[PDB]
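Objective 1.3, modelling of assemblies. Example input:
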Amino acid sequence: AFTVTVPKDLYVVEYGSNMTIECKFPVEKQLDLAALIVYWEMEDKNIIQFVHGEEDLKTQHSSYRQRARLLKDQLSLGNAALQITDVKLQDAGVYRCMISYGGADYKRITVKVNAPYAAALEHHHHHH
Amino acid sequence: AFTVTVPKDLYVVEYGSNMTIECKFPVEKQLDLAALIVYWEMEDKNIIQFVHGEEDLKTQHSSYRQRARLLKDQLSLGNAALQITDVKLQDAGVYRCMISYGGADYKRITVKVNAPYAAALEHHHH
Amino acid sequence: AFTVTVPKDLYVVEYGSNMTIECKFPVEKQLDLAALIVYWEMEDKNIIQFVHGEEDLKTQHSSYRQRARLLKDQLSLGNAALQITDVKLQDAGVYRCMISYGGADYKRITVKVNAPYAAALEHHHH
Amino acid sequence: MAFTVTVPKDLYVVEYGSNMTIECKFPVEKQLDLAALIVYWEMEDKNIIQFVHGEEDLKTQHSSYRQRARLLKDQLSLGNAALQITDVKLQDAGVYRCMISYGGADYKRITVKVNAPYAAALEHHHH
Ligand SMILES: COc1nc(OCc2cccc(-c3ccccc3)c2C)ncc1CN1CCCC[C@H]1C(=O)O
Ligand SMILES: COc1nc(OCc2cccc(-c3ccccc3)c2C)ncc1CN1CCCC[C@H]1C(=O)O
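Predicted structure (tokens):
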């Protein structure tokens, strides 16, 4: 069966760091971008929609505008990698990588964000 | 772009009743069952996995056993209908219909379950 | 030790209905209103504050205005009864009755609200 | 002068495996009367501490807070209900409530965030 696999289902990241979360899918021979769909989301917020080679920010939340990208290089190697830059406390939660490629599956990834008092205080009072 | 559609994104159902939650997908010529994938879940629990024109029970959460059925006859009209029988308070929450058919999409449906005191008390203690 | 008791820790109420949720506290003979503090809340929202023998609804959450009242006759019988009118889906959740009377204690009460589609839909969008 | 509990910090950030003291202040005029003081500490409706007229009372204490939690009794005479929890775990993260009756009654909320490295986070993730 078409199986999406996650080498890590748990990421522990420092506030302000960069994170690449990886979802693997089978690619035999050459990638057919025309048949590939990748959706990345966290708790029903859309981060990435890559449908036949193009991305649509349509439901792409402002939270992930400027900070989230899919690493396109990795796609031909069967790696749908979400890179988030300048990780914030609001990025903690359960991510889903949803892949359709002649077959469909999704996996969940848990992200925990560690932060110092100063970042935690700002998030606490000014809710990001 | 391939779009899954839900006529109702909210269902309010009575404890003990039967419920059909429906999601639509475009079928603009003879349904190709071989290319259709339908996945139904609620809060990470698998209810239905319809691949290669048949259903796989190897994944059902065991809270949905004998209670969950996908209505196949409708797929040719582009309706992925989940029928749940003997609705329980545990069936309340956010459902997802995930469809792959030359394109892929999903929609969320919220189910609220109304129950009398007697049923609610049992669910409360457990 | 001073013990607050709740005969029912679970209430099931209809949208638009009325509800009286009760917490019991020990009273021997004359209630001393001067020493009695009763605070009722739900998820951090103040519903009722009876201090120095009078209701103090200057801390009441706006969601409970005109809808919430402590039955002051009941206090003399050792019953802190919160009566809520025109129950909304937002009223569902965990209530706490906090009592200070020569001693202090609290208990939790769960309220579930049954509602028709029309009320559920408005709550769903708001 | 309504009886007011005050928290100098409503947010604590603690490292996994460390010890934490979280504090709630209450008005004490002259000398504390232990006989009139009740302090309850709880987190998400689990009881951690019950101090009723001068002693601990395990009337509602949850088993997780067995030999991990104490009230600093010295601090009470200064009007400080200080909860010390030892060997902080990821499950100790959340909203704490200090409930004080001393003539009047009030409660305040304190948020604890627990930072943990991958090894501790992984154990919590599976267990
Ligand atoms: C996650 O559970 C499963 N979901 C699905 O379809 C999901 C699905 C169905 C339909 C559409 C999408 C989609 C994909 C990308 C974007 C939007 C939606 C998705 C994502 N098919 C099998 C299983 C389970 N099955 C057996 C156990 C191992 C893995 C898997 C397998 O080998 O296929
Ligand atoms: C928490 O809010 C309040 N709680 C209460 O009684 C609680 C209460 C009442 C009765 C008993 C206990 C208790 C104490 C210790 C243990 C168990 C229970 C408790 C804990 N009375 C006023 C306010 C509100 N008050 C006015 C304005 C806002 C804030 C506060 C203030 O400014 O003083």
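Chain A is about 10% helix and 40% strand.
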